Point group: C3
Chain length 402, copies 3
């Protein structure tokens, strides 16, 4: 199926959803890994997860597995989780703390910067300098760790310069992960995004979220117009109080920040609309700060509120499988059972994620039929989906080309 | 493996079973879907399952999923279970009742004839007339629903004209499904058929069925001879009493009807040989009416008795997986616990199906070996298998050709 | 991936581990089956498992399944487990006893030499002489059964002549299987071997085994040197007492025998180092006889002790899956609960196998990464791994070539 990616891209019907092969074909999926996930910057973890020198996590991206580890100098570095002897995984656990990286097979021992310090009985010609752990590009942006698997990484600095002032409001280096949830959705990674970038399905599918989150297309979507005055008043209210808020969509479509108002009265994504956490994460001047929306394709969407923040990570597994990992961030000194209640903090987005998963899964299932033919996106209700698809096709064409 | 279907077909050894690739190869399986299951008429359901206007079922055939739904005008129609917006499955459940077909993703709402009645905020250029549900051919034959996935369906009327008078004896529009059983057999769909079209394995494998069902090859098989006089006397007894019974095999081999006698004394497929249901389904003049045998390749075999009927449906899943769905039909006013007992009604064919599944599964497992070489079919004991294989190869060659 | 096996082999970096494709690629795995497992001699079972005329086992090798059966004349024969009618498996069970081989589908009945004795109603032209069970080459070597799936088997006699005198010490025709364990390791079959042919990982991974088994590289490995004097003294002690012991590695690298000393004091692979069984299997002159090490690629490694013996069998399942079957052999008259205790006899190698499985599985997982690059084998600690890889590449090149 599809001949080649060039022909598939050239056949796309403007304003419509993607040809079936984009969502089902095994070769297109490998192209998506090679041209997108193995070339672009990827959101990995909040930095607060690496709490001490020697702290690490491991992270699977396609066929890669990456160790992300905080050094004795407190700098976070990334490496391929693959011993230079016979290839074994070095860190078997998803998280831990170790003063060295020690391969469990034959004990080759690496410094937390990747250098091989000891390898037993390798004989007179062995060169430890040629057998250090292979490196992965790693950046820290206002308390969030990004990685890149390519030999040569694209620019990070345009993104960082735009996003840093919005993100600094939330003091994320002093957060902790109050809760993590990882779900596997039986849909193509692109269907997860298309679903995330519209609220056309909200009225019919999200009771708990719709108590606080407007299904206004100017909030979620990408509109060409002058800013609606309710949005602008919120931007000005927040900026007068020292919280960067104005809408910014990058020129190439990869990322967007905007601090959008919630529904009348609402402070946070909770059943009652009130803040979940009594000790707030960051410097929000008032409880009804709305939500700082941030996306950065292909891996992350996020909501940063007055009291807590929620960071999301998308990792493709197969043409019809995608992991979504959600983390709720609260102030590091906020105590469960005193300053917040775990169920109250998490229930809205746990329910919302499952609802999104359901619609994505039945969308994929219908797309599997040879009868599927892509229809048109709603110009007003799915402007964000059109924008995502344009980012994807344009990026695929550029990264594939010369 | 096999180069192409033309070469595989051209290499078939007359009178022998099929080359391994026919039963194992992934490309041959896709050819079977494309040339047979996606082109021919397929038995779906008894009409009695759609009990009211708005009633529907869904049905998977290969990668297709079909909604079969009874309209407000009582006409049963079929559609692809795929929304014209972004492709979602519309009906998630295997069965239900709805006055409209409403997509659960963004609520596009279709009439029970497939027309798009409402789609929210699709903008000034949207044409609802171009976004109706895609249709599937659908026919009702004496209370049985058949479908066809091809753009242009083959003739149905020769089949219907032959079969209708035999089928009308059983008054199937006034039946109900007393019981349904669906099993996945770990064999190629062709092995399920080859097994169904012989009773060479009966003596060794079916104790409960052999109490009532003769393993005479003139009953199950396809013999060139003049009709054995015990069979002819039954045909005449039944026809004198107004029940069409005489043997008919279609010219192209696709279908066969004949009302065959059961063993001495037996009325029905029960452990004691007596009718299972006190209130009979249809107009049988006497209890020992034998069984109306009907096959129609590639999807259905059936047994219609004096008291009840059993209809079977074969749907391929993978090269080594096949679903067999069995439904026991009784008169709609027959009450479980009064007019019949569920265990008594169903036990013989539940056991027989499991026995068939076992032999099919160990046949497939042996065929998987590179040592497998097709042997000869018994000319007398497997005349029906030879006939099935000839239908399959001839149909594959015709549908593939110009 | 890899273009073809010739190019992959030609690109191997001397002294290093194999390119990723050798351990992951589906086509290379099929080449390994076709060129190695379907051409060479394979260890199947100890003969003592077939205790009586009519006794059989079945054995899966890739897509083949083999019946190994003891005849009424006490000769063990092998056949393809595939009926000559429609291909069914004949023997569904892993083991049993039958005076004839009777197909369960339609009862074709074969003699224990494979000849078709009866097939019902096959008509006047049927030739039973042309429908006997297809044969598999089968040899018995001092109580151990080997098979070969090729039309023409390679020489067995050089192997047999070398190994017989070492093996006869252990009187294996008078053993019984005290215990069997089969585990599926989530690694390529070559990783199982590479792991087996070194003790570089021993210090870090095998507490129970290291109580008795030296991690000396001259014991496990393949060294060019003059024999270390502790090894030679053991060879001479054992040979003076009539037990063949001296090191022999075949010219082509396929097999090796040597009776190696265990650690100070140790008699057997037990937690306390003492013999597990009071009634010894074979003629060992003293309890501290060391272990007769035997490998024969691609299927078997073994340890034969004074008191009991352990025989191991490697069967590939998929590119990343390998079955390891371990059998503990004791004297046929040794009684569990009197002459030995099952836990004491088996615990060391059950634990050791699981430990090996763990390291093999995490080695495979790391190798799956596109970042994997083969490193160098330890010249002194992994001489046996270098030797195995050389046997594999040389055999693959010879069997593939003209
Ligand atoms: S594979 Fe890591 S030390 Fe050997
Ligand atoms: S996919 Fe059906 S309404 Fe959107
Ligand atoms: S398949 Fe063995 S007797 Fe028919
Ligand atoms: Cl969102
Ligand atoms: Cl039948
Ligand atoms: Cl060993
Ligand atoms: Ni949603
Ligand atoms: Ni259109
Ligand atoms: Ni049967
Ligand atoms: Ni023949
Ligand atoms: Ni080991
Ligand atoms: Ni090197």
């Amino acid at each position: 199926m599809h001949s080649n990616i060039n022909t598939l891209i050239a056949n796309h019907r403007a304003g419509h959803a993607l040809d079936q092969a984009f969502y089902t074909d095994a070769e297109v999926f490998q192209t998506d890994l090679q041209e997108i996930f193995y070339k672009e910057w990827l959101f990995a973890i909040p930095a607060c997860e690496l709490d001490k020198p020697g702290s690490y996590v491991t992270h699977q991206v396609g066929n890669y597995n990456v160790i992300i580890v905080r050094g004795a100098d407190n700098v976070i570095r990334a490496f391929h989780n693959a011993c230079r002897h016979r290839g074994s995984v070095i860190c078997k656990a998803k998280k831990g703390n170790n003063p060295k990286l020690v391969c469990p097979y034959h004990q080759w021992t690496y410094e937390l910067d990747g250098r091989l310090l000891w390898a037993r009985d390798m004989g007179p010609d062995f060169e430890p300098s040629r057998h250090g752990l292979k490196t992965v590009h790693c950046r820290e942006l206002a308390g969030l760790i990004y990685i890149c698997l390519a030999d040569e990484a694209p620019d990070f600095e345009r993104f960082a310069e735009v996003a840093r002032p919005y993100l600094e409001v939330h003091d994320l280096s002093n957060a902790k992960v109050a809760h993590e949830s990882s779900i596997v959705e039986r849909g193509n990674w692109k269907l997860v995004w298309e679903n995330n970038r519209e609220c056309y399905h909200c009225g019919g599918n999200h009771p708990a979220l719709c108590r606080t989150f407007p299904d206004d297309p100017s909030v979620t979507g990408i509109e060409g117009g002058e800013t609606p005055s309710n949005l602008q008043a919120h931007f000005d209210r927040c900026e007068q109080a020292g919280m960067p808020s104005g809408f910014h969509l990058s020129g190439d479509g990869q990322f967007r920040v905007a601090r959008m108002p919630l529904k009348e009265g609402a402070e946070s994504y909770t059943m009652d609309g009130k803040t979940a956490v009594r000790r707030w994460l960051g410097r929000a001047a008032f409880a009804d700060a709305g939500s700082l929306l941030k996306f950065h394709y292909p891996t992350t969407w996020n909501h940063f509120l007055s009291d807590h923040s929620i960071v999301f990570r998308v990792t493709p597994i197969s043409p019809t499988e995608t992991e979504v990992t959600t983390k709720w961030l609260v102030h590091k000194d906020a105590v469960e059972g005193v300053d917040y209640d775990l169920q109250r903090l998490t229930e809205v987005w746990i329910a919302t994620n499952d609802e999104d998963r359901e619609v994505v899964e039945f969308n994929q299932m219908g797309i599997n039929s040879p009868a599927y033919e892509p229809g048109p996106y709603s110009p007003t209700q799915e402007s964000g989906v059109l924008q995502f698809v344009e980012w994807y096709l344009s990026t695929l064409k550029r990264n594939s080309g010369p």
